[PDB]
Every structure is written in structure tokens, then in C-alpha cells.
Design a protein around this motif. Structure first.
Motif, short mmCIF file in Angstrom:
data_model
loop_
_atom_site.label_atom_id
_atom_site.label_comp_id
_atom_site.label_asym_id
_atom_site.label_seq_id
_atom_site.Cartn_x
_atom_site.Cartn_y
_atom_site.Cartn_z
N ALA A 76 88.76 40.79 51.67
CA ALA A 76 89.28 40.00 50.53
C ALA A 76 88.53 38.67 50.33
O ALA A 76 88.26 38.30 49.19
CB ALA A 76 90.79 39.73 50.63
N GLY A 77 88.24 37.97 51.42
CA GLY A 77 87.29 36.86 51.43
C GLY A 77 85.86 37.28 51.77
O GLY A 77 84.91 36.55 51.46
N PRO A 79 84.48 40.69 50.70
CA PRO A 79 84.30 42.01 50.08
C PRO A 79 83.02 42.71 50.55
O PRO A 79 82.04 42.03 50.87
CB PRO A 79 84.22 41.69 48.58
CG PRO A 79 84.86 40.33 48.41
CD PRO A 79 84.62 39.62 49.69
N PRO A 156 103.98 29.16 45.07
CA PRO A 156 102.76 29.80 45.57
C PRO A 156 102.15 30.78 44.58
O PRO A 156 100.94 30.94 44.58
CB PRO A 156 103.20 30.49 46.85
CG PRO A 156 104.34 29.73 47.26
CD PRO A 156 105.11 29.38 46.00
N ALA A 159 100.17 28.82 42.31
CA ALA A 159 98.94 28.42 43.00
C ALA A 159 97.90 29.53 43.02
O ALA A 159 96.71 29.24 43.13
CB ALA A 159 99.25 28.00 44.43
N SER A 160 98.34 30.79 42.97
CA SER A 160 97.44 31.93 43.01
C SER A 160 96.80 32.14 41.64
O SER A 160 95.76 32.76 41.54
CB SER A 160 98.15 33.21 43.49
OG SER A 160 98.95 33.80 42.48
N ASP B 181 85.82 29.85 54.20
CA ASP B 181 84.96 29.54 53.06
C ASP B 181 85.47 30.28 51.82
O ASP B 181 85.33 29.83 50.70
CB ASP B 181 83.47 29.84 53.34
CG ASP B 181 83.18 31.34 53.69
OD1 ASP B 181 81.99 31.67 53.87
OD2 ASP B 181 84.05 32.26 53.84
N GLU B 182 86.13 31.40 52.02
CA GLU B 182 86.80 32.09 50.91
C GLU B 182 87.94 31.31 50.19
O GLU B 182 88.29 31.68 49.07
CB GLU B 182 87.28 33.49 51.37
CG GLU B 182 88.63 33.58 52.08
CD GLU B 182 88.61 33.21 53.55
OE1 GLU B 182 87.54 32.86 54.10
OE2 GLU B 182 89.72 33.25 54.17
N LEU B 190 86.33 30.16 40.87
CA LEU B 190 86.45 31.13 41.95
C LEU B 190 85.11 31.88 42.13
O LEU B 190 84.76 32.74 41.29
CB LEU B 190 87.62 32.08 41.62
CG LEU B 190 88.74 32.38 42.63
CD1 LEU B 190 89.16 31.17 43.50
CD2 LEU B 190 89.94 32.95 41.90
N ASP B 192 82.30 34.43 44.33
CA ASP B 192 82.42 35.90 44.42
C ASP B 192 83.71 36.35 45.13
O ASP B 192 84.64 36.79 44.47
CB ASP B 192 81.17 36.60 45.00
CG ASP B 192 81.48 38.03 45.52
OD1 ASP B 192 82.21 38.77 44.82
OD2 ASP B 192 81.06 38.47 46.64
N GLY B 193 83.79 36.27 46.45
CA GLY B 193 84.97 36.81 47.12
C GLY B 193 86.15 35.85 47.28
O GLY B 193 87.02 36.08 48.09
N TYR B 196 92.42 31.55 45.91
CA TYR B 196 93.18 30.32 46.05
C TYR B 196 94.05 30.34 47.31
O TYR B 196 94.75 31.31 47.59
CB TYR B 196 93.99 30.03 44.80
CG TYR B 196 93.11 29.78 43.59
CD1 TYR B 196 93.13 30.63 42.48
CD2 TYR B 196 92.22 28.72 43.57
CE1 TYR B 196 92.30 30.43 41.39
CE2 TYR B 196 91.40 28.51 42.49
CZ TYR B 196 91.44 29.36 41.39
OH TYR B 196 90.61 29.12 40.32
N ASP B 197 93.96 29.26 48.07
CA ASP B 197 94.82 29.00 49.22
C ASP B 197 96.27 28.85 48.74
O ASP B 197 96.57 27.91 48.04
CB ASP B 197 94.34 27.72 49.92
CG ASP B 197 94.76 27.63 51.38
OD1 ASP B 197 95.50 28.51 51.86
OD2 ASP B 197 94.37 26.69 52.13
N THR B 198 97.15 29.79 49.08
CA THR B 198 98.55 29.70 48.69
C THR B 198 99.52 29.45 49.86
O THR B 198 100.55 28.80 49.68
CB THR B 198 98.97 30.99 48.02
OG1 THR B 198 98.72 32.10 48.88
CG2 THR B 198 98.14 31.25 46.78
#
Lengths: 403, 403
Positions: A76-77, A79, A156, A159-160, B181-182, B190, B192-193, B196-198
């Protein structure tokens, strides 16, 4: 004499929710009311993604009946953006984007990891366990409407969507005071007939927990001019003004006539227990609520009347107050026909495993201890009489104000 | 593999409740934990007073069943201090000091008047409706014990003793961060991969509403030396250090080995759903809680594990998790044996007065919406399998964190 529903409908029908607004960072929005619809600027998820962890796969490399090596992963972070070979699969975690070409994700049901690849039990001709870009939230969609009270459940999500701040209705401003020569501040010695002012503290605390901005003018001295000015200053700075005790709730005196001059106030006698009197009406620029001097009556009258009024003023389109449930009493309750009686009780689970209520003790309003001993109100109907063990009863769990 | 009960009990068994205190004015004590017994400095009431609105009389006047003229009033701030002649009675309000020589209080309800006085229509017994000095609270008695969470139920009672401030346990201090880093901040675009930090916002919100002091260190740079400096800062400032995403919950990597360097951290696999992984252990001067990165998981783990830990740490002698009640489902529930499943449902009143639960819908950890739509957890037993409409199920209402 006046029913509670009637009093409450009288109050609410007259109130217009607040609209003035302010924009605040999400971290500051707990319990605040959205002033405008939150519309999503983006697709959630941002690209086709996995709903489960396991392996992303293809059409014909499953129809080939053989094992499929792990040629990469997607978290997800990180890919997977490799070269994605022929008859292999890609390890994948929940929320990770599917690699290009993937047509199915297989969970940890039908995966047996081997030396030569993963093996799969069933087949598929569809996107099993794939969240498509925007399956959750599509861009341009209303995620939360105006009137929504914001909580950990909603913020949240916001936030997303990449949103740092959202508009919220401003806090309802509430001015508060008591009056009377008999009243004394705790921490100060009592004079000859004096008592300590407790109502005002109780209301201040409930106010702050409800999310209101509080203006506590204190104890106004027994003087027409001082009380009149306290009224004038409170009305000019607040949306609501509360006398926590000392202003007339019907009786004739100099306070009642200040009310007559500064506003249009009705004095009601409600068909409740505890309590009976309540003052309510419009001042020039605020709504006035006058509570009786008895602490139990004031607290109950604040809780069942003033609290809903504040909810509606704040712009909240849910409702204040918790929902009632029907439970068996494990106690004989003494109830007198003619008044809706909010007794205090203790709602507990029996050994059968079922919830029952039990009385806290004496229900008289000469003591305050029923509120810390109980965890609910037993809301007993106006024309109902004594209540025997085993009868069914309506019960209203205390909200956060009381623990 | 390891049960939630075992894990919970290992966490709490290690924890020493805080004892340092500060003395605050009551209006500032909502949600605060009393550091010492509040001991009554006085008798309550300070004088025999009335339990009821009505009339104070003497048995000899009642025995002459003649109507009794009202000679005066006792109210609460304003006791009756005049002469009280034979054949009369005194008007009395709830809380008001009973006048000298009064042998009983007769409620208004059993007392119809005439032109020539008050007619007492029922049997009058000695002592009736009179609360004697010290009978509510006795001087020297503990009114509220150390460990009590203060609320509107309690603070006004403390105020009624003339006490303006109390010692309460200092707030729990909680440091918070994430790494990756994601992870991106709001308003920033945003890559590439990226996501947002939720979780960090979710945890921050929840911490503040639980009354903790929060130190939010942000997103820590993706290297060991930055991470090492985060922990040193956090641990010197805080009682609990929380990673809301990015520090290892068992995966070997540079965060796992920093954790291992700076503390004694266990990495559990928990027999729960959603979730499973949890990091926990001792740093030099603080506890460490490591959360998993998936939002539904991190929130659930925070709610069921970290929240009880903070409640104990705070000095509270009560539970901060709601009680469970036994309810029927109006939904079929998919449930695999082996994990204790905290599903989300919607508890509601059916047309027949009965409380039942419904599923929120899909229970996968790929979306966050079940927390909003829901109002409770359905806590399905570890060994339990699918569940049919009508079956009994344990249910735990959401606390204030989710509305």
C-alpha cells in the motif's frame, strides 16, 4: 399541569439553529457540528485495491492447474511496479493496490505455500476481494452531511480525503448566573442563614461537557439594578442565558418584573417529578431558561429541557439525550399518578444474564446522592401508579454528564 | 494464538497507577481522578430539615382535628425564626430547616385547605418526612474515595460541603508518532504509493477525549537515528509512548531493532478480529504500545487494549470500557472460529419494545465506515461460528469516542 413533551415541543419549534461558522483543523473538531457537507475530492481508495491479504492473481494461470511463485509484493505504501511475469502471483496486504493485470485476490483460505509456488483450491471468473477505485468513497460524493457531529468515527475519514480543516458551526454561547443574598461561594465562610451555591457549578460543568462556550457571571447580588445589568450584558453576549437559581419561576418579586421588562417569559408548571417550575422565553437577542432552586429539580430540568434545546441550537441534526429501553424492575417503585417521574436507578445484569433496574434508594429531592449511585433514569409514565417487582419499565441510561 | 484476556492481564498487572497530584477548583475537575478521600468537614444537613414540600406541624395540633392557620414559612435560605403559636402550622419547602418543636412534615398532597386553615387529611406519624442532622452526610465520613472519576454527580456534592478545590491525580501524558515515507500530511499532494496518515489523528483525538495530555511528534523520518531520537524525546516526556503506524509489530527491520535496543518489548499475536499484532513493553521511563497500520485494526486495538491501560494508569478505580448486555441479532453473522470477533452493529429498539442488534454491513478492515454507521460492538466468542437470526449475542455499546 403542563406535559413535558408539550413544553419541549413549545421550546424547540421556536428555535432556529445557528449558522455562523468557522474553519478549524481536524484535531480541534471533536464534538463539533459540520457547517457544510464534506464532498470528497478523491476516489477512496485511490486505485483498485485488495480487501484481504493473500495473493493477487490472473485468469489463465489459475486455469492452468499448477503452482504460482511469489514474483513480488504490494503493501500500500510500497505497491508492486515490477515486470509481473507469466504464471506467478503477487503477495498482497489489505489496502495495497493490485498490480496491473490482476483480476482476483485470494485470501488465506485456499492458499498452500510450496517450494515451487502457491497452490489454489477453487477458481474464479471475477474480481473477488478487489476494492475498485472509489468503491468506498467516490469523488464528488457527500461523505458527511451538514449537521453531523464529528467524532473519531468521522474525522479520520475526512483525513483520508486529504482535508486538513473543515467548517463547523460556532459554539453556542451560554451565559450563566445565580442570585440571592443567601448564596455563598464554596471556599468562603457561610454567613448566618447562607447556603452554598451548587446549581451554578453543576450547570457550568454540564455546559462545558456539552461543548458550549460558558460565560459565568457568578452570584449577582440582590439588587434590581445589578440583576437588570447582568441580564443586559448576558443577553448581548450569548445565545442563551440561564439562571441556575434565584430568578423567579412564577412568584411575584422584583426579578419577575425585570423579566417582564427585558423579555417575553412564560412560567410553566410541568407534569414531571422531580421538579415542576420552569421559566422560558425570548430576550432581545437570546433565549432565557430559568431553573428552580432545588438542586435535584434544577439538574433534572436542565438535563431533560435545556440540553435538547442546546443540541438543536448547535446545528446538530442527530438528537441530544440517549435512547430508552424496556427492562424489568427488580425493585418495588412508589409512583404517584399525575406526573412523569424520572427516578434514578441502577441498571445491572443479573445471573440469568439479562438487564434489570433497581432503585438507588429514597427518591426525594432533599438529597443528591441518587445521581452518583444510579446509572439511569427510570422514566415512569404520567398516569402510572406503583410498580411491582417484575414489571416492565422504561429506562434512560445516563449520558457522560453523570459518568 | 494468545487471548485478549491474557494480554490485557499481562499489561495491567505490570502497571503502577499514578499518584502525583495537583489541587484544582471544582469547575476544572470534570473527568479528573480524586487523589485522596474527600472527607466531610460537616453534618448534612446541618439542622433537622424537610424531606418534602408541605407543612410542618406538631402532633398535639393534629390531634385537635381542627384546620390549622399558616403562621409562617421556612424555605431553605430563609428559615422560620418567628413565634410558632398553638393551633398553627408552618409552610415548608424541601431542604428547609424544620422549625423548633416541629414533630412532623405533612406533604402538600395529604392536606386540603379551608378558609380557616389547613386540614390534615391523613394519619400524621412522629418524625415523618424529617431528615435529621447528619443523616445524609456525617462529619468525618468519607463522601468520595480516592480513585473516583469526578463528574456532575459528585462535584456539586463536594461544593455543598463548602469545598472549593480538590487534589486530583496529574493527567497521564502520552507521546505519539508514526513513521513511513508513504505517509503524507493534509493539503500535500499524493505521490505514487502514498497515503494520508489517519491513525495518528484517530489516536490523538481519542487520547484528548480520555483526558490525556498528548505530545504528538508527527511523522518521524524513515531512518534509525531519527527514530532513536523520537523515542528518547517521547520517553523523557511521557508515561506512555504510542506508535500509531510504522514501527514494527513483529516484522524484522530497523524499527524492530531500535525498539529492542531501547526497551523490553513483547510482540504479540492476538486471538482477535479485526487485528492481531500488538507491541508492548517497557522503555526506560514509560510504557510502549505499538499499533498495526491498518486503520480498523489500530483503532480496535487502541480501544480494547490501550484504553484500559490508560484508565489504570490514571488512578481510576473503575473500568473505562462499557458493560456488555445480551441481545438477539436481527442479522445473520459471518464468524470463523479461533478469534474473538469485535464486529460492529447497530443496536436498536424493534416495534415490540425489544432491543436487538443488526450488522452495519460488511466487516472487512478495508473500510472505516462501520464505526460511523455503528453504535456498538458485537463481541462474538472465540470458538463461535456463524450466527443465525434470533440467536443471543454479547453486545458492547460504543463509548463517547465514537458518539
Amino acid at each position: 399541569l403542563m406535559s413535558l413533551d408539550t413544553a419541549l415541543n413549545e421550546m424547540l419549534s421556536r428555535v432556529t439553529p445557528l449558522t455562523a461558522q468557522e474553519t478549524l483543523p481536524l484535531v480541534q473538531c471533536f464534538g463539533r457540528i459540520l457547517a457544510s457537507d464534506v464532498v470528497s475530492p478523491l476516489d477512496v481508495p485511490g486505485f483498485d485495491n485488495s480487501a484481504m491479504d493473500g495473493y493477487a492473481v490472473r485468469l489463465a494461470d489459475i486455469a492452468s492447474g499448477q503452482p504460482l511463485p511469489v514474483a513480488g509484493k504490494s503493501f500500500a505504501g510500497q505497491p508492486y511496479h515490477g515486470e509481473w511475469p507469466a504464471g506467478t502471483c503477487i503477495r498482497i496486504m489489505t489496502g495495497a493496490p493490485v498490480p496491473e493485470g490482476c483480476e482476483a485476490v485470494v485470501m488465506q483460505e485456499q492458499t498452500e505455500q510450496m517450494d515451487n509456488g502457491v497452490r489454489f483450491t477453487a477458481e474464479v471468473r471475477s474480481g473477488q476481494n478487489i476494492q475498485r477505485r472509489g468503491e468506498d468513497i467516490s469523488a464528488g460524493a457527500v461523505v458527511f452531511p451538514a449537521g453531523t457531529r464529528l467524532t473519531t468515527a468521522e474525522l479520520p475519514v475526512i483525513a483520508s480525503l486529504g482535508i486538513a480543516e473543515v467548517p463547523v458551526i460556532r459554539k453556542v454561547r451560554v451565559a450563566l448566573f445565580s442570585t440571592g443574598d443567601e448564596l455563598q461561594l464554596p471556599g468562603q465562610p457561610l454567613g448566618d442563614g447562607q447556603i452554598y451555591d451548587t446549581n451554578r457549578l453543576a450547570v457550568h460543568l454540564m455546559l462545558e461537557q456539552l461543548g458550549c462556550e460558558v460565560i459565568n457571571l457568578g452570584i449577582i447580588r440582590d439588587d434590581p439594578h445589578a440583576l437588570r445589568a447582568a441580564f443586559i450584558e448576558a443577553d448581548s453576549q450569548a445565545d442563551v442565558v440561564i439562571s441556575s437559581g434565584g430568578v423567579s419561576v412564577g412568584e411575584a418579586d422584583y426579578t419577575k418584573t425585570i423579566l417582564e421588562e427585558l423579555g417575553e417569559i412564560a412560567f410553566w408548571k410541568l407534569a414531571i417529578k422531580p421538579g415542576k417550575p420552569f421559566a422560558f422565553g425570548k430576550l432581545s437577542n437570546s433565549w432565557f431558561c430559568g431553573l428552580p432552586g432545588n438542586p435535584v429539580s434544577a439538574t433534572l430540568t436542565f438535563y431533560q429541557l435545556v440540553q435538547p434545546l442546546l443540541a438543536k441550537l448547535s446545528g446538530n441534526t442527530a438528537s441530544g439525550l440517549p435512547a430508552r429501553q424496556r427492562v424489568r424492575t427488580a425493585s418495588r417503585l412508589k409512583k404517584t399518578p399525575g406526573r412523569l417521574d424520572f427516578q434514578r436507578g441502577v441498571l445491572q445484569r443479573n445471573a440469568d444474564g439479562e438487564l434489570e433496574v433497581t432503585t438507588t434508594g429514597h427518591q426525594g429531592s432533599h438529597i443528591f446522592s441518587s445521581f452518583s449511585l444510579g446509572n439511569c433514569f427510570i422514566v415512569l409514565e404520567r398516569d402510572r401508579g406503583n410498580v411491582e417487582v417484575g414489571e416492565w419499565v422504561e429506562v434512560e441510561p445516563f449520558n457522560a454528564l453523570f459518568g
